[PDB]
Amino acid sequence: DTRLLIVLLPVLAAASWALYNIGRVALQQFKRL
Amino acid sequence: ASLWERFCSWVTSTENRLYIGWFGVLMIPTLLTATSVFIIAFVAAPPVDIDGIREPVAGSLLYGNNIISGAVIPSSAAIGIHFYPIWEAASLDEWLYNGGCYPLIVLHFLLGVACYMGREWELSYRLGMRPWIAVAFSAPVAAATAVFLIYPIGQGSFSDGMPLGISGTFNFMIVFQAEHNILMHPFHQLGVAGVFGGSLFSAMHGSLVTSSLIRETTENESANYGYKFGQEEETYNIVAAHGYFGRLIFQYASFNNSRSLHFFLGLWPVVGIWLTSISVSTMAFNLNGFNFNQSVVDSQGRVINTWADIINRANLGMEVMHERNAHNFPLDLA
């Protein structure tokens, strides 16, 4: 269990950088339609 | 106007029913004596000592041998790759016991398709067109050189070549995969991707033409009667068959240039059979396939078998049982 969150922690680091640059512009899409 | 130029303009004349050009001065008499010896020695040849161990193999129609068992048997291994014509025999039936019919067919057939390949160039010159159908026939000619000539050159005798028969080709393939591992060779691997891939693209391109035909025909009659031969316009929408296949995979995975599409039909099986014909000829000089026997070992050093070992237990079982009394020493041609 404890090594599962060593694998998914770069995945959580990947989506955190993805939701930093897109979270202004992904809010534009869901409010548009 | 000369006595030769009047003959020289008949050979290179396109008015004949079959083109009889200057390569056809060599392939017509060589194939017709590779036909007349093949038809006679399939029916009424005597049994042939193929291995040179004085045990003849009876592969003609008189001696039993329904046609998924009969074969023009290869030469004797005591002869080897020595030149064995009729006049270097003491008698004609002594020539038949050592298997003289196999180099008389296969040196005339190989010289006949080499001048079929030049004749396929030659009509593309006198008709005024692009000439590279000789290049596309160089994939079967090399593959007929690989099993018939280059594998007897590398492996010694003419008995190692492919027997001219249906069950002889299945015996040639099992003995090959015993000693050369063609199934795990990465150039035969490309050839079956040009054989399955070529069979894919025949069933793919031939489908998309016949599924997008414009109806110059009625309902009850046949569809093929709507293409008048020698017409100017295309009989099928290339833009609709591209818009079909651009919806099937995605839009840019499909050639709406029909010349680059049709070149890809001439590139995928022809390069693949070029790589098969190399592989059998590089295995003729015993550069075999991949050998991952006993590669996976654990920490104690005990051998763990992989899937290449169960191929090898097949490869070893057809190794001990082929040529069942022709071996006297423990290693096969080592």
Binding site: - | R17, G64, R119, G206, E233, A240, R259, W307, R313, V320
Partner: protein, 341 residues
């Protein structure tokens, strides 16, 4: 408007990849079969199934790695993850061999979803349905070698395992134990596949060779727009060339491309008819006219009679290693060796 008519408007809309109503069956089932092979070739062993290490995790490359067939011990089981064999546990279900029936059932429901897709594109754009018909060859090999061949046999063990070298067992498995090559339905199939590889090579390299000088450049690939009315190649010259080189030649471009449909598919459908008969051991093994003769004449020999002895070499040497559940404990004196090796 509507509710069911709404979902038909969205699912059949024009996008980069097309979903369609077949995409509710194709796009999940193609994903878990193509992806389920790629995660068992990467990680999942076969050590408790066959005694074989076959994955990239335990030291195999792209050739010698597979999701292997489940067991003889299970025996025709569908092998669900929730099933009675491997109840709930994912790690046991990978170890029993249950990924093979995860792939071969999603593959058998994905090829339904792709052939329903080829019906759904050709109906929407307005074409004829001759691509779902030509795909019925590849359906009838997957439904008859991976499903109808092991279901008649003993278990899922004797099926082809999804891997590169594990198929190369199955070709030599049907040579030694079945004399597959002498089967005339397979010999109908070799002349369908090597005939289709001829027709793709000889038609593709004669319309790149009898084509009209439409452009002015040295390369000819630029001289074609898709929406041109005129023919991009000369049918009369290509008819003239093969009438004198070969002797026969096509005169119908419309019949020519149907012959490129019929020769691979009716070659692939005929060899599928034979391997249905190979599930029942209704094989074309031996010529009984020549086995009576070779027993009643100890100097009668043919390449057929040499092919039978090669099959008893394959079936007696591989049997201790291929089927380890049977416990074949053949000593070294009783298996058929030849002489000196």
């Amino acid at each position: 408007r509507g509710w069911f008519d709404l979902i038909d408007d969205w699912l059949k809309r024009d996008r980069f990849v097309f979903i369609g109503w077949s995409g509710l069956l194709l796009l999940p089932c193609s994903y878990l079969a193509l992806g389920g092979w790629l995660t068992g070739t990467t990680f999942v062993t076969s050590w408790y199934t066959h005694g074989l290490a076959s994955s990239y995790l335990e030291g195999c490359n792209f050739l010698t790695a597979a999701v292997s067939t489940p067991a003889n011990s299970m025996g025709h089981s569908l092998l669900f993850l929730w099933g009675p064999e491997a109840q709930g546990d994912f790690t046991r279900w990978c170890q029993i061999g249950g990924l093979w029936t995860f792939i071969a059932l999603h593959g058998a429901f994905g090829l339904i979803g792709f052939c329903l897709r080829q019906f759904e594109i050709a109906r929407l754009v307005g074409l004829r349905p001759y691509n779902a018909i030509a795909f019925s060859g590849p359906i009838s090999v997957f439904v008859s070698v991976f499903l109808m061949y092991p279901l008649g046999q003993a278990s899922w063990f004797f099926a082809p395992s999804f891997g590169v070298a594990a198929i190369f067992r199955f070709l030599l498995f049907l040579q030694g134990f079945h004399n597959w090559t002498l089967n005339p339905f397979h010999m109908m199939g070799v002349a369908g596949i090597l005939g289709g590889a001829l027709l793709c090579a000889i038609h593709g390299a004669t319309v790149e060779n009898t084509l009209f000088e439409d452009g002015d450049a040295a390369d000819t690939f630029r001289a074609f727009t898709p929406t041109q009315s005129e023919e991009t190649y000369s049918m009369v010259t290509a008819n003239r060339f093969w009438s004198q080189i070969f002797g026969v030649a096509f005169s119908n471009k419309r019949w020519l491309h149907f012959f490129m449909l019929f020769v691979p598919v009716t070659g692939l459908w005929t060899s599928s008819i034979g391997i249905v008969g190979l599930a029942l051991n209704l094989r074309a093994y031996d010529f009984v006219s020549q086995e009576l003769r070779a027993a009643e004449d100890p100097e009668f020999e043919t390449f057929y009679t040499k092919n039978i002895l090669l099959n008893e070499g394959i079936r007696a040497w591989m049997a201790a290693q291929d089927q380890p559940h049977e416990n074949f404990i053949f000593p070294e004196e009783v298996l058929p060796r030849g002489n000196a090796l």
